[PDB]
Design a protein around this ligand. Structure first.
Ligand SMILES: *c1nc(COCC#C)n(C)c1N
Length: 165
């Protein structure tokens, strides 16, 4: 699969993760500069979304939409991942009041990008994460995957909420 950004077409780098595959656990860094494991034990659904940067308008709308679901669906674990340092993630989350959302940084190991196959290849956005959504079931198996073809588009929220119902 390819991703488009205006005139640029990106190859996706890292390991291809498919619907039906066991999702790999990866090390990320949270707002307190604490290393955390992506996967949560004993929750019905885990939603893991990635975006190029929280600095961007489309990116912030995605973060705002997952912050709202965090409160509406407490039985579902929501995580948003970017290559932004935890400091900027905390600053932007603070200003926008997105305090319930689990915001994690892939900067240290690029372990999410490499293991979920959403690392953007050569181009202006190279090394940033493709806009993407994975839903895992209670076994940690991928039951839904969207890598957004046009990175200027928001994720398909309707397709996603049908998976969580
Ligand atoms: C996330 N999405 C986008 C696309 O447009 C938003 C803007 C600006 N960007 C730039 C990020 N960072």
């Amino acid at each position: 699969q390819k991703v488009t950004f205006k005139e640029e077409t990106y190859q996706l780098e890292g390991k291809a993760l498919k619907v039906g595959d066991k999702a790999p656990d990866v090390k990320l860094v949270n707002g307190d500069l604490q290393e955390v494991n992506l996967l949560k034990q004993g929750v019905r659904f885990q939603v893991v979304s990635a975006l190029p940067s929280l600095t961007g308008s489309v990116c912030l709308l995605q973060a705002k939409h997952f912050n709202e679901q965090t409160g509406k669906l407490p039985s579902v674990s929501f995580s948003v991942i970017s290559m932004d340092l935890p400091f900027s993630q905390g600053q932007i989350a603070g200003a926008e009041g997105i305090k319930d959302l689990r915001i994690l940084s892939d900067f240290r190991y690029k372990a999410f990008g490499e293991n979920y196959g959403v690392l953007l290849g050569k181009g202006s956005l190279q090394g940033l994460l493709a806009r993407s959504v994975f839903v895992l079931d209670d076994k940690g198996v991928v039951i839904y995957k969207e890598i957004v073809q046009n990175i200027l588009e928001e994720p398909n929220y309707e397709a996603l909420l049908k998976v969580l119902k």
